Design brief:
The structure is a homohexamer. Chain A is of the alpha/beta class and 245 residues long. Chain A has a single domain (1-245), classed as Rossmann fold, CATH 3.40.50.1580. Helix content of chain A is 27%, strand content 30%. Chain A is built from seven helices and ten strands. A five-stranded mixed β-barrel of chain A has the order 5-9-8-6-10. In chain A, a hairpin with a 2-residue loop joins strand 3 (47-54) and strand 4. The radius of gyration of chain A is 17 Å and the shape is globular. Chain A starts with 9 loop residues before the first helix and ends with a helix. At the B-D interface, helix 3 of B face helix 2 of D. The structure holds 5-fluorouracil (6 copies) and potassium ion (3 copies). One potassium ion sits between chains E (47, 66-68, 71) and F (47, 66-68, 71). Chain D: Homohexamer.
């Protein structure tokens, strides 16, 4: 195929230039199933991809897996195939008391607690979302009347210590991360996730457009682990996609 | 003699103002306040000249910051003590992309942190990112007046010379860190250089203050190092201030 | 389910204390089928987990996906469930001229060109493999007869720029990693992969045992993109560690 | 019609000047100049106000820098393009050692680099160290007039608030890096805080220029955070030190 | 006179030796050399005292490095210029784990880089890892001698005092970076403190030289700061000599 | 017995001494002490040879530090515990400026911190700066004897080879950080390279102790890589008299 990990060819994209990139492979089909003419493209490792049509235009929906490293592979390979706009949709844990489960978060930029971002730009470069993409996400949110918050997100290379979880095997957190939640909290950070800094950084420094939207599944001021609906963040990412085609 | 050590202002002076406009040049403070209703000179200490004015019935502050993040940080901190919650910076800048022309207006989504003052509010991992309401209000203001606008990332440097990789200087040398840097910022899509935005955006975004950033291009570095001897920016910032009140 | 991502209970493990952790979830069944009574436990996201028996004890085979981040999840949730020893098996790109495709590499310690490792120990801490696991892997390779190389591995958060590939959309590599492959080469580094730094660091810093073995699928002194002995080795090493 | 972009000055304006005295406050420039012979205003742009004067026959410049290392780097760079080789900074400062009183004079031998601009001239490992000749001139001037003097290390901060660990602020918080920091600089024997020295000293030491630094104490941080409302030994000392550095 | 600037040795002096044992203390060089055949004193300049001996028909060098990465880096480099390819460090150490006793033997797999010299050879991301053959020979040597042995990670510090979080000092102060650090290394499973291995291991691992590190514990930090002037064992010495047989 | 773990000295051995001259070479200690009154050998353990002597009726210590910051930090700490408050370092150095000649004397105002030990006393932002009274003494002493002197910044390196960008070495490689660095220090007016000043200067300046540093130039790196006098010794002893 045309790309090493994804197993896709330029032919599979049929002219698509926008991709919606969830973290979970099993969500790919459900997102594509909201659009016209969904067709499965390929399934390798953590990269599941579908093609669909939105207003007569081809759109790609491809999973990135968990974390910057695999995310960077999806974005890079999708870029080689002609994608220029990436809309990530994920799940997220909120760290502000006024943000509720079910709420929708739109990320203007990300605190860079990852490692892959640095493979694209030095630390001082901002992991900032594209203005057109963020606008579109914001305006989509309003059109469906979702409770939406816009601002900064913390993007961690780990789910546990980097998000200062203590309910773990070691029950311990390295110095850099000890007390860090309350720090990000005092600094207005809205939430924690694991892909945004890689996605936003590599795209802002390579001429690609990226936006990030997330559904709040747990509030960290209350508990550490989410319980066993996200549909809002999905309807919003598809509707923003339309405005960007 | 007042409520704040450097600005020489009292809370009574602001008369309930909650948004300030912050130029670099003390001289330009009067020119900007005069574009609004009931301009009243308040104080002038060191490089901190401040006027009060009125915009659609509500009090607004205009206050110069001087050159660079340290005096900018003084002025934002003291104005915030006096009740200011939204700051809009208007400035001049050197463009580093060929397609950007002298006279064009740049709106900054976020900045590369090539300064030190920002580090005094948030660690380097934190994004020097503009508020989304301010950025939107600038962009929509620039459209209302029909100015050539570019929206993106700005390199924000603690120096005018080596930090912007100028070689026509006394030493004629540039420290390793910055040698080759302008070409790198160019490849990453950075639009321009200036000296106050990293400090401004970081301190605001990490403390719950809203901040935007707009600038007029006075030189293009692809052509020359030093700008020529010589209004869009000012109109836009006043107009955005109106939309934000 | 007692853990958030893996969908596993302690009951599923039947007392297992050792896991073999490959990157590719489609490789978990093959590895498991080399052992006895292979059973499919769970499969969520990139985490596909099988249980089998070896040396008359329960063993876990569980995929981590690509990169430190999803690796740190698997290792932490398996640890919570009883796993004390982790045997990494992956694929890798060699950067030394004398290392051919089909060779087997055992990592003693890794260059930390990753981020997740810092969520466990500051950069000064070595990303070093456990000495028992490393021995068990090297002796297993001397018995299988494979061509083996032992040493330092460069563990990257990216497949492309971090490994100094230029045939990419941007064709660009950030200042940090520009010229970096020849640097590692000159420092004796054997190969590139993407998970070892995180695994080694989080394990060596929390009283867990880990080791790492990989089969070479490309040699970078020849090309950027690549056109079963490591599997037998990793299974035999686990046999010894039980 | 100038030779430099910010200061609005020509090399002819300096009339052979090779030593500059550099206060922070534009308004203090005339007053310092008048303490010497032939005081004449040169230019005034933004925070850079510049007067020429004469000291024992030799032309001298007095030029403000504004607050902070960024505007200091500019003024120093453009002055050096116009011929200045020696820079004497005169400022105000907040002491953090108990035995140092308001009204005392401080001569900096080197600064803690808590700024950003110094890094545009040298990496962190390089010392923001003052020139030995300037430092000697300042010390011997202070002793000649019998001013209470302290000689040693200064912490130079890119901010007035969080960097000098002030909590009486809008946010009321200080970032991890600076939390507990004032107590540390105290234990380390640091005399005081100010905002320009690290940049000035680093850029001059690494570019073959001579720099000296003397400051008046206007508040003691063991007593209070903000200096009160309100002899002149510091300014007297810098002009006296300049006579020896000519 | 000589071929190298500090050691005062010529290639001829080494008699074709390829392996060196490198203790810290000059006064220990003779003792270790005396354990082998035909001990001969080569040179003694500054803190570099070097003997040559014969182990199993092969020439071997014993050379003291002094305290710290800097002088260690000098010895190793000049010994390398003279043909030495394998380096075995033997020293004393202070344990930070409760279960490690005075007189116990420690074999370092890799080290925490709390030094400066290693950065002159390799960026911090690079592991200060011992050679796998050297480590193996040392562990097997320890088995044969029946020594109480622990294998693991060592913290290698540029100072004796603040870097190893000692407070009974002139200042009684430890800078923020090292404050609370001992207990952090303890929780990360680090066995001990010493002052040379990070530099030794790193400059060797990154320049195609083999190195291994063994040390005898002379104090336990969970008990006291300064070692008593005892349960001391010269096992380490025996271990390194026997390991040298395996590496020859 | 001993009060200090490495030096093997008790406070009784110092007899009130509060100043020490500290060379790198153990072998040099006796020759330096023999320039003063009533020289007596105190102890010699590993690389720390210590002598006591009198200068104008006052006891002074001469103690070797060995090569590098780590052992220097030991000798300084332990002497400090024994009552030493002022340290005068005398060393040898390689000049990196073409105008500085072999045999010239260098006085260090401050050091570029290319070591590791200095960081165990203060963060990197802190200046490795000499004490002004010691520097004044050294400079006026050098003026007193009539030696060719340069005053300024020194580069203090944790290695002799790569940190000082020497390429004639086993691997003939220099890691990225130090590649091109000598030319950089040269352009920043750095005078010279040695290996102990950053540590001695930072630990003394952050702990209320006085330190000065003077060095004799034995090689000029613009001319050659490896070196192939006595003025710095005169100066550090003469300066010792002024600090007493
Ligand atoms: O990285 C995260 N993803 C989802 C979550 F709910 C969370 O808390 N953290
Ligand atoms: O900081 C800057 N301000 C204005 C300019 F024109 C420029 O190039 N740089
Ligand atoms: O991380 C990597 N995995 C597989 C490879 F072939 C390679 O070169 N790098
Ligand atoms: O930067 C400062 N200048 C003057 C002062 F009094 C102070 O405390 N800080
Ligand atoms: O570096 C050290 N060597 C020996 C010891 F006993 C100790 O505690 N630290
Ligand atoms: O550290 C050094 N000491 C002495 C020298 F001659 C030299 O070049 N470098
Ligand atoms: K200013
Ligand atoms: K993954
Ligand atoms: K030594």
């Amino acid at each position: 195929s045309d790309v090493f990990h994804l197993g896709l060819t330029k032919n599979d994209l049929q002219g698509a230039q926008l991709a919606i990139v969830p973290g979970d492979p099993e969500r790919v089909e459900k997102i594509a199933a909201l659009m016209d003419k969904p067709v499965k493209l390929a399934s390798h490792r953590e990269f599941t991809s579908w093609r669909a049509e939105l207003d007569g235009k081809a759109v790609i929906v491809c999973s990135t897996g968990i974390g910057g490293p695999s995310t960077s592979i999806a974005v890079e390979e999708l870029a080689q195939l002609g994608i220029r706009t990436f809309l990530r949709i994920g799940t997220t844990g909120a760290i502000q008391p006024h943000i509720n489960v079910g709420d929708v978060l739109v990320t203007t930029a990300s605190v860079r607690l990852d490692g892959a971002s640095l493979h694209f730009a030095p630390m001082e470069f901002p992991a900032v979302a594209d203005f057109a993409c963020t606008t579109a996400l914001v305006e989509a949110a309003k059109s469906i009347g979702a409770t939406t918050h816009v601002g900064v997100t913390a993007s961690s290379d780990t789910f546990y210590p980097g998000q200062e979880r203590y309910d773990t095997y070691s029950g311990r957190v390295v110095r850099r991360f000890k007390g860090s939640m309350e720090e990000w909290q005092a600094m207005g950070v809205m939430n924690y996730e694991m892909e945004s800094a890689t996605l936003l950084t590599m795209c802002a420094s390579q001429g690609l457009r990226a936006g990030m939207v997330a559904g709040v599944i747990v509030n960290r001021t209350q508990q550490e682990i989410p319980n066993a609906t996200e549909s809002h963040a999905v309807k919003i990412v598809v509707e923003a996609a339309r405005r960007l085609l």
